[PDB]
Write a protein that binds this ligand. Structure first.
Ligand code: F3S
Ligand code: F3S
Ligand code: F3S
Lengths: 322, 45
């Protein structure tokens, strides 16, 4: 299975995260799983005209392209020319057009590629967009009706960056005959990773249940949930970040950092407008503006009051102790 | 006798039926009193 991994408006974080892959690690994925990595800007040996030969052979159908991985945004500025992202003699968006049209499967890795991500933040100088989404709005660069040659839409492996497993396990599934096991949600994300929430497996959910808030960073995060004071988007964000830990160690929320909802197409949420960074926007100083997914402010708040009154003592003390 | 007078209700069918029904859901009474004890010992909390 040939893989061509291109980077548009990328920071290469998805590649670096991918390189952190374990079980399989990246080398075993590239070699031992029958995935022929044709080229990758961070890893491909070919430069210049040899690399362009590889790209053109993929684009024109001279050689098969099974998986086109795209990382980074599709940069369309200036004026829709895409010349703020010139790659191998073309605007990167033209490469995207050709290769997405050539690939059996197109995988957008990372929010930039999936939805536009950080570069698509206003004022979006690069005219960045995702492959098939611009933020939540379906269509992105390739249009809502784009399908790869295997009939799939762009497989969106979101995250900023995506966790290595979010792509590697998909690649293994494709390589092991389990492509049919891959189900995609409405954002084209693999449901095997994105039916759960970041909160799922968060070490602070018991504090969340009892509405015990982390009050401060550092040692303050030895207790409490980050939802109330730090804008944790865990309960509104689909991800397996607390199921499949980052770097096989931790997750933002475990570590005391609020989930920024990076697997969600709106990321960065509120465009990091003043007062929204590591803060919970609240109505009347008590009611979070955004409640967990599938809840309503009145039942949430009622249950929150009930949970506060019935809170056990341990939920009000440090638990992640030295 | 007073104590034998209650011992007579013990062999009274309807009284026996009700007492045996109290012994049926005795667990629930125990758990509600345990819940009350718990709530009391966590009343400060
Ligand atoms: S990791 Fe980097 S490539 Fe985009 S998805 Fe995040 S800015
Ligand atoms: S339970 Fe965890 S995911 Fe965030 S909302 Fe609380 S720190
Ligand atoms: S910011 Fe992203 S990496 Fe996981 S903890 Fe939140 S979905």
């Amino acid at each position: 299975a040939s893989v061509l991994w291109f980077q548009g408006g990328a920071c290469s974080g998805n590649t670096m995260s991918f390189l952190n892959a374990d079980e399989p690690n990246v080398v075993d994925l590239i070699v031992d799983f029958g995935l022929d990595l044709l080229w990758h800007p961070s890893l491909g040996l070919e430069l210049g005209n040899n690399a362009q030969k590889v790209f053109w052979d993929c684009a024109k159908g001279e050689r098969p392209l099974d998986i086109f991985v795209f990382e980074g945004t599709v940069i369309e500025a200036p004026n829709g020319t895409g010349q703020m992202d010139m790659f191998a003699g073309r605007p990167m968006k033209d490469w995207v057009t050709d290769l997405a049209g050539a690939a059996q499967i197109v995988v957008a890795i990372g929010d930039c590629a999936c939805f536009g991500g950080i570069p698509a933040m206003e004022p979006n100088p690069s005219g960045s967009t995702g492959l098939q989404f611009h933020k939540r709005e379906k269509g992105g660069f390739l249009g809502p009706d784009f399908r790869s040659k295997m009939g799939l839409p762009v497989i969106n492996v979101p995250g900023c960056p995506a966790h290595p497993d979010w792509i590697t396990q998909i690649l293994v599934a494709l390589a092991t005959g389990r492509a049919g096991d891959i189900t995609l949600d409405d954002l084209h994300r693999p449901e095997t990773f994105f039916k759960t929430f970041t909160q799922t497996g968060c070490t602070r959910v018991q504090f969340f249940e009892y509405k015990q808030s982390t009050l401060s960073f550092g040692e303050g995060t030895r207790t409490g949930c980050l939802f109330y004071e730090f804008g944790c988007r865990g309960p509104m964000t689909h991800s397996p970040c607390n199921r499949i830990l980052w770097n096989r160690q931790s997750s933002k929320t475990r570590a005391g950092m609020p989930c920024l909802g990076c697997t969600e197409p709106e990321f960065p949420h509120f465009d990091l407008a003043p007062g929204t960074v590591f803060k919970t926007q609240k109505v009347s100083g008590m009611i979070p503006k955004e409640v967990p997914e599938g809840t309503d402010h009145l039942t949430y708040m009622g249950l929150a009051a009930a949970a506060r009154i019935a809170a056990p003592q341990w939920s009000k003390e440090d638990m992640f102790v030295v | 006798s007073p104590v034998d007078g209650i011992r007579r209700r013990l062999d009274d069918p309807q009284v026996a039926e009700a007492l045996n029904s109290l012994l049926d859901h005795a667990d629930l009474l125990a758990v509600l009193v345990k819940g009350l004890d718990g709530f009391v010992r966590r009343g400060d909390d």
